[PDB]
Design a binder for this molecule. Sequence first.
Ligand code: FDK
Ligand code: MG
Ligand code: MG
Ligand code: MG
Length: 531
Amino acid sequence: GSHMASMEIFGKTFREGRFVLKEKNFTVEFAVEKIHLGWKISGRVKGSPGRLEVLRTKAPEKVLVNNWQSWGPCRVVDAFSFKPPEIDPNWRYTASVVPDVLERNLQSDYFVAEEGKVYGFLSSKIAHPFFAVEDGELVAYLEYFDVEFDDFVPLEPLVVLEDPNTPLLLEKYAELVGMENNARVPKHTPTGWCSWYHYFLDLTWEETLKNLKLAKNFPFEVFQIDDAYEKDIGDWLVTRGDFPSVEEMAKVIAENGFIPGIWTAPFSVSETSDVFNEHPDWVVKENGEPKMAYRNWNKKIYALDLSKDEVLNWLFDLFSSLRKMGYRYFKIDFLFAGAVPGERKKNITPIQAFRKGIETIRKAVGEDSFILGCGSPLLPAVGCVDGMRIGPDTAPFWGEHIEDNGAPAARWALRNAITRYFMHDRFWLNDPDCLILREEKTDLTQKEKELYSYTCGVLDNMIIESDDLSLVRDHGKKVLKETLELLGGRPRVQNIMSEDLRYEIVSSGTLSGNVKIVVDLNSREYHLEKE
Ligand SMILES: OCC1=C[C@H](O)[C@H](O)[C@@H](O)[C@H]1O
Ligand SMILES: [Mg+2]
Ligand SMILES: [Mg+2]
Ligand SMILES: [Mg+2]
């Protein structure tokens, strides 16, 4: 095709074959090979590749772009009329791991799509793979963060797929990612309860116990304590308020017949924490001093340096201790912190460091524990997590005055469940964030609760409820029951390039047979048909 002859690969005219590029500072050896639905570019690199240009082609007008982490948008953008965002200096790295790009040009992490075409990297093991629109050209890069390689390391493979069925392409892409990374796709999806979206930081053990008793009347397997119990970020085995010990909490939850679950932010240590105050050289640095990874909880939060053996040992000991207590469901959050650019003890990439950290956690919790990632780089976590939050936080409100900028809102949480649907049952189980089904202490309507819940069910996504269970009555019980009956299928979002927040979603082979739901996030309406 005329468009394919127009591509450049490592600066050379596109064509099938086997090539060597010897530059001043680096060497690439790569192959361009035909695969089903398109092409694969793979090989190996050594030296100092820096920010390595892999592919160049003319930019499409409308592109599906993807943020690197859980909370960031996956959405269709007009590439021509793009203006750089103002990046919040307290959250710079959720917006981009290469913020020099985003402050100038449109950025997409891991993959980008247009009608009929997907460009997608199959892994992020060493480099960060991304796309930029640079003076009207789409450019694919592998970022090596100034790391030098004495011997060859593998490229992250790039595929270029074409077919009129864009959803089929994204599904194919994700199947290839799953194979490249030995994705975990559990045969069972947990149900359960989470404290966060009712109680927030104000959870008490008294209220937890009330819910633990009521949970016996609900179809919940896991009972997960969120952020509230811990005295500080990093001090995960020290509790506060009316909480008992972390070990005692697990025992109470297990005595009551649930799988105990717990939230941590394990790559994060606050400026006030015992662990940071004891171990000031355990963190990622800038000009030799602690580098803020983000600000949250009204504190500067630092990133653990996952290149250091002392740090990995501490993480192993923490998670193995939690396993010994009986926790078997782990929500591990703010994981981007582990992958911040900066100075580390070993001269490895932030992505290499990140992967050492999450692999340590998996080793510690064992094969029989469920790991839910959150706030996380997506591609580097494939093969390690069982489930992954794939959108910004939901909320007990639709979010009429909330922009698509990452503040909590049911409407934007649900958008990302739809636009990242194709990762589900291929990368991991997708977590669309919790259902909020209470009928007091909420501004959600019955129709909004139904729209969110039934969409998650058609998508076969994880179903976790987050409510004061005393405030969930006949409607909320009915909605959860019906939602669980929509699970089990193979979903497809038929019109993935939609720009008006209306989506047509089918799922084959659910517990309710073949189903279709049309959802309109702007009118807050749905139309569900079950065969
Ligand atoms: O601090 C608790 C918390 C923070 C993040 O915004 C998560 O996505 C949210 O679900 C909650 O665990
Ligand atoms: Mg005690
Ligand atoms: Mg989510
Ligand atoms: Mg499934």
